[PDB]
Structure formats: structure tokens, C-alpha cells
């Protein structure tokens, strides 16, 4: 059913690149991201069970993030069904932080545009983004799974990891052998929206709730099995 569903029976499911930024340069004024190693391990295990080739990268500068993505986009993905990139860091709308400062998300994703990474053309490219968002066609076959709505904060628990990644991993573990990915992400939306409420000594951040935001420019259904 290659018409309506992405072909996921290539020899390899594909890469899952996890960028786990925990510690930031003093100049950025950003605090360390307690809980993020819990997310990175949860993701590594979850995507391993889905048969992705996971590469865990830690504490990358913004230059390193760009070069990593550039190099990854230059690999031969001919035998791979899909591409996944998970970004764990501080962020603002349209921006993810390297350890030494911000980089535009567009700079990262542009390497994977249909006309720029030919061996991924027509294959789904999933960008999973845990970060705040405070303020063929070029982008076909991209999916952005944002932890939060435009303009909003995204919460991270020091013990359990981020609400969104915890929930994503749980829903993939439970449903990836059955449900299409948008439906898995819809259950993630519900879990994060209903099961979490923030605790903070800072009133600005206390007693708040969060809803993730699925942005799909996919052209076919995605099932993690075949």
C-alpha cells in the first residue's frame, strides 16, 4: 500500500539522532537541564526497540549541531526508510540552543529538504523537539512533534524527564506496533495535557499546564512496522 502509507520495509528503519544539551556556557545565562539524561536514555531505548540506529550526542555547541546535521544529511540513506532527529535543549520560537548559544531550527532542517538530501526524498523526516517556544514541495514529508504550542513554555521534571518525552516514549512503547504515528502523537497530546501540572517556587512557572503541538507536512501514513 505504498500509495497511502510510507514504505517502511527498507533494510533499515533509519537513523535516530538525539541531541541532548544539558550544560550551557556561562555567557548564555542558561541553567543546566536536570532530567534531560533521563529523556535521552528513554529515547535511546524506545527507538532501539523500533529498530532505529540511534546516535546519542551530548552538549553540542551551535556550530557542532549544524555540522552534525550537515554531515548526517550527506550520508547515503538509500537503504533507510526514514530519518528521526530529537532535540533536547533550551529554546524559543523557531530556535534551539547549542551549549554556546541559539541556532535557527530552519538551519538544521534545511539540510533535509527534498532537493538537498536526495536519498531521503519522499521518506518521512521527523523532528521531535523538547524546548520552549516563547516569542516535490520544499517541506513535504516533514513532521515536527513540538513539546508545546507556539508561544508557550515546555516543562521538564528533574527526576522523571520532560513531560512530553516521557509521554512520547510511553505511547510509542504501548502503541507503535498498532497505531499510525499521528494517532500515537494524539495520545501524547492527551497524556501531557491531562496528567501533568507544574510545581515551581517561581509563581510564573507554577500550577501551569502544557499541550504539545503536532505539525505535519507528511504525505502518507506512517506505521513503525510492516
Amino acid at each position: 500500500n505504498a500509495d497511502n502509507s510510507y514504505k517502511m520495509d527498507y533494510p533499515e528503519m533509519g537513523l535516530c539522532i538525539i541531541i541532548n544539551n544539558k550544560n550551557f556556557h556561562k555567557s548564555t545565562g542558561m541553567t543546566s537541564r536536570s532530567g534531560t539524561d533521563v529523556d535521552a536514555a528513554n529515547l535511546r531505548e524506545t527507538f532501539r526497540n523500533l529498530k532505529y540506529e540511534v546516535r546519542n550526542k551530548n552538549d553540542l555547541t551551535r556550530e557542532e549541531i549544524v555540522e552534525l546535521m550537515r554531515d548526517v544529511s550527506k550520508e547515503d540513506h538509500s537503504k533507510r526508510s526514514s530519518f528521526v532527529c530529537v532535540l533536547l535543549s533550551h529554546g524559543e520560537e523557531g530556535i534551539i540552543f547549542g551549549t554556546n548559544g541559539p541556532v535557527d531550527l530552519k538551519k538544521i532542517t534545511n539540510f533535509f529538504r527534498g532537493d538537498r538530501c536526495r536519498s531521503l526524498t519522499g521518506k518521512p523526516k521527523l523532528f521531535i523537539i523538547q524546548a520552549c517556544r516563547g516569542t516535490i514541495p520544499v517541506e513535504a514529508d516533514f513532521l515536527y512533534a513540538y513539546s508545546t504550542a507556539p508561544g508557550y513554555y515546555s516543562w521538564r521534571n528533574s527526576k522523571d524527564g520532560s513531560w512530553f518525552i516521557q509521554s512520547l516514549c510511553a505511547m510509542l512503547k504501548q502503541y507503535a506496533d498498532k497505531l499510525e504515528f499521528m494517532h500515537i502523537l494524539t495520545r501524547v497530546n492527551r497524556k501531557v495535557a491531562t496528567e501533568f501540572e507544574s510545581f515551581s517556587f517561581d509563581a510564573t512557572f507554577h500550577a501551569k499546564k502544557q499541550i504539545p503541538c503536532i505539525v505535519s507536512m507528511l504525505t502518507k501514513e506512517l506505521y513503525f512496522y510492516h
Binding site: 537541564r33 532530567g35 523538547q130 516543562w155 520532560s162 512557572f205
Partner: peptide
């Protein structure tokens, strides 16, 4: 909890 902390924010990103």
C-alpha cells in the same frame, strides 16, 4: 519542574 523547570522550563526549557
Amino acid at each position: 519542574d523547570e522550563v526549557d
